[PDB]
């Protein structure tokens, strides 16, 4: 019943970030009725962690990729490319106001948006935790069939 | 028929790097008998992409990754280029052959097994993934390394 | 007069990081009696800077680094923030006290001695640089590390 | 006439075998064609590979000493973001009142402001108006006499 979101991020790498940033994002996602697979939580060797994370990406319904930073985290980027090729739902989160881009259309490297529509890709692009609950944005719509 | 290799790199972004670093790498790959898809040339991303061409560039690079036989991924830098990494993840998800290239001697990893983020090797064997990891341009020709063996 | 620490970080660029990550660090520094200059709030860089403002922001942060007594440099990230590093270099050249913060467990270096690019430690002593290298917000108040000894001694 | 000013050539290019070999020498040549004494730190201070623990402090102080003693920095600020070691060096250069020249032939933007293509602090030691003259976007452009490096050499 619950849609499953793989929450890809670099926030597990920093003690303070793991503790303070991830839980509010998880709460906002769960308040939408989503089942959240957060990889740092679900983990707790290197090869087993990689295949574990690979299996989760294969089996999610959508990825919600935290793409903060200059540049976005390379592991998130790989997990995002996996998700595009496997036709998962794609949602992007960036509340970083810096622009690190190769083009005028997008605020980031244009490949991050190759799995998103030409028009209305911004409906999938979240710029604040406050925005996740929005019924006018693609996450809510995708959960309600629209 | 030549096996198709998509050469993913961030080298088309710098004029000097485009001109000096990519052609030698393209050559060593064509010397194995490979057909090389180099996306900055192939799909003409030569400058800061205009708003009305960014989508076409993106969909063109994506289609080459679907249609190649393997990715040769230049993973220099701290960290590896994000577009390269999207393209590499596509490759892994689509079961393409995977070849990694890094002649950068800096060590940036989240784990002590691999010299980079463990997720970059997810598409490579647990044992002998080093055979797929090239550390120098002259190493591409090596007859004991996975690219030559991949052409059998 | 309180000792002045310039809190250099990339955390002001992210809405959530600004709101949740900086205040706890600010408080850990103030608990030692430090006057904390946090440049995003001080010099009002709260979004993508308008062109007519970018130079004034740069001179204000540059002045603040000149007028501080030491820098507390958040050097999380791969690689560390470039603005933080310009500011750190200024701090080194100006013989400010230097303290580095990184609670990111990834190691990202060009040498086997230091966990980061060795230039970041060029203003730190040859032996005992780890006393200037904090790896947790909790560790900041260590009555045994270089920041506490700097305030007191 | 033109003076034999010392440029410290800060770059990430010595980290990559192929970049050390093909990318730096043409930049060194372009600078030397202007009559400059080039201090390229990878070659000058022997940073060849992943430095040994017992060698890393000397590399650091040697790069640092060279930035203290140069007349100007030529900073290759390619990449997203620019290299952190180059940036520390550019920080020291700004604070020591050294001459500042920026090289970026990377067409991507990684910036926090609309005025500059990079973090606005990279330009803090550059003038408010006319900073473009200190900003080089091609190896060919380095020897132009209408740009700030040429003029810095002639003008006292
Ligand atoms: C595919 O690889 C390069 C590196 O970002 C870009 O052309 C691409 F187009 F995205
Ligand atoms: C100096 O302090 C913060 C760190 O990015 C920015 O304003 C700065 F402006 F770079
Ligand atoms: C000093 O270290 C930095 C790393 O970027 C290089 O520029 C150096 F010269 F070694
Ligand atoms: C999958 O890769 C990235 C590393 O950033 C994390 O999201 C993971 F779980 F390890």
* CATH, residue C130: 3.40.50.450
Residue bearing tokens 């997990």: A79
Is residue B137 a contact partner of residue B24, using CB atoms and an 8 Å limit? yes
**Could you give the 3-state DSSP secondary structure of residue B7?**
strand
Which protein residue has the closest C-alpha to ligand 1 atom 8? B83
Question: How many CB pairs (< 8 A) connect A and B?
Answer: 140
Name which of B58, B61, B73, B88 is nearest A110 in CA terms: B58
- Classify strands A62-66 and A99-101 as parallel, antiparallel or unpaired: unpaired
Q: Mind giving me the DSSP string for D67-106?
A: HHH-SEEEEE--TTTT-HHHHHHHHHHHHTT-EEEEE--B
Task: Give whole-number Cα distances, A109 to B30, C59, D108, D136, in Å.
Answer: 28, 30, 9, 23
SS3 for A12-81 is HHEHHHHHHCHHHHHHHHHCCCCEEECHHHHHCCHHHHHHHHHHHHHHCCEEEEECCCCCCCHHHHHHHH
Task: Give whole-number Cα distances, C68 to A11, B27, C39, C80, C97, in Å.
Answer: 31, 54, 12, 21, 9
CA distance B55 to B60: 8
Question: Across chain B, which distance is largest between two alpha carbons, in Å?
Answer: 45
Phi, psi of A37, deg, nearest 5 = -105, 100
Phi, psi of A65, deg, nearest 5 = -100, 115
Q: Apex CA C119: angle with CA D65 and CA D140, to 5°? A: 80
CA distance C107 to D81: 18
Which protein residue has the closest C-alpha to ligand 3 atom 6? D85
Residue C127 forms contact with D (CB below 8 Å): no
Residue C79: list chain B partners with CB under 8 A: 78-79
Nearest-Cα distance to chain C for A85, in Å, is: 26
Q: Which residues contact A29 (CB under 8 A, 6 or more apart)?
A: A5, A7, A36, A64, A132
Answer yes or no: is A60 a known binding residue: no
CA distance D122 to C68: 20
**Could you give the 3-state DSSP secondary structure of residue A87?**
coil
Residue C117 forms contact with A (CB below 8 Å): no
Task: Retrieve residue A62's tokens.
Answer: 């959508």
**Burial track C102-129 (b if 16+ CB lie within 10 A, e otherwise):** bbbebbbbbbbbbbbbbbbbbbbeeeeb
Phi, psi of D110, deg, nearest 5 = -130, 100
Give the structural domain span for C72. 4-152
Is residue C7 a contact partner of residue C41, using CB atoms and an 8 Å limit? no
CA distance A13 to D141: 42
Report the run of H or E that residue C16 belongs to, with start and end: helix C15-20
Task: Retrieve residue C45's tokens.
Answer: 């860089």
Distance B34 CA to ligand 1 centre (A): 20
- Classify strands D109-111 and A99-101 as parallel, antiparallel or unpaired: antiparallel
Answer yes or no: is A135 a known binding residue: yes
User: C-alpha dihedral over D13, B49, B63, B36, to 10 degrees?
Assistant: -40
Considering every ligand atom, which ligand is closest to the CA of D12?
A: 3
Residue bearing tokens 């690190």: A100
> Any bridge partners for residue B71, and if so which?
B6, B98
Is residue C92 a contact partner of residue C98, using CB atoms and an 8 Å limit? yes
Residue B95 forms contact with D (CB below 8 Å): no
Is residue D2 a contact partner of residue D35, using CB atoms and an 8 Å limit? yes
How many domains in chain C?
A: 1
CA distance B31 to C43: 57
Is residue D50 a contact partner of residue D116, using CB atoms and an 8 Å limit? no
Class of residue B36 by CB neighbours under 10 A (exposed 0-12, middle 13-18, buried 19+): buried
- Please give the method by which this entry was determined: X-ray
Task: Retrieve residue D66's tokens.
Answer: 């060279």
């Amino acid at each position: 019943k619950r849609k499953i979101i793989y929450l890809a991020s670099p926030y597990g790498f920093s003690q303070q970030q793991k503790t303070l940033l991830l839980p509010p994002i998880v709460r906002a996602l769960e308040a939408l009725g989503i089942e959240v697979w957060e990889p740092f939580a679900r983990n707790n060797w290197a090869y087993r962690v990689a295949q574990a994370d690979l299996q989760d990406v294969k089996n999610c319904d959508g990825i919600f990729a935290v793409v903060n930073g200059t540049p976005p985290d390379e592991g998130v980027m790989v997990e995002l490319g996996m998700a595009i090729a496997l036709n998962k739902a794609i949602f992007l989160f960036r509340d970083d106001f810096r622009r690190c881009s190769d083009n005028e259309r997008y605020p980031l490297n244009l490949m991050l948006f190759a799995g998103l529509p030409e028009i209305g890709w911004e409906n999938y692009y979240y710029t604040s935790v406050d925005e996740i609950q929005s019924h006018d944005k693609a996450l809510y719509k995708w959960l309600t069939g629209m």
